[PDB]
């Protein structure tokens, strides 16, 4: 895929928000490192229960696939949501 969103993940360990490349494809969602450009973690679209599209932060609810959800800071939150729903529209 080429559709990647620049998001910032707030994890513990440091107060610095980590720049992440949120790869939204017609088949999966991959977390690519912004500087290393490597894929850390990838999810299937079929594991999407819901998502929260806010103008400052975006949250992906993978349900019972892992502990908690995936929340990242980005102004492209709705763009992400729209794109996921777009790819999902192709499968759905």
């Amino acid at each position: 895929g080429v559709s990647f969103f620049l998001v910032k993940e707030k994890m513990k360990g440091k107060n610095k928000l980590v720049p992440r490349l949120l790869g939204i494809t017609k088949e999966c969602v991959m977390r690519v490192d912004e500087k290393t450009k490597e894929v850390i973690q990838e999810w299937s679209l079929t594991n999407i229960k819901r998502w929260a599209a806010s103008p400052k932060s975006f949250t992906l609810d993978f349900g019972d696939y892992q502990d908690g959800y995936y929340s990242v800071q980005t102004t492209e939150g709705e763009q992400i949501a729209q794109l996921i729903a777009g790819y999902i529209d192709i499968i759905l």
Partner: peptide, 15 residues
């Protein structure tokens, strides 16, 4: 009754 119309999008391929 707690709605989540805006912000929360309910997808239907969560198997």
């Amino acid at each position: 009754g707690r709605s989540k119309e805006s912000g929360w999008v309910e997808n239907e391929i969560y198997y």
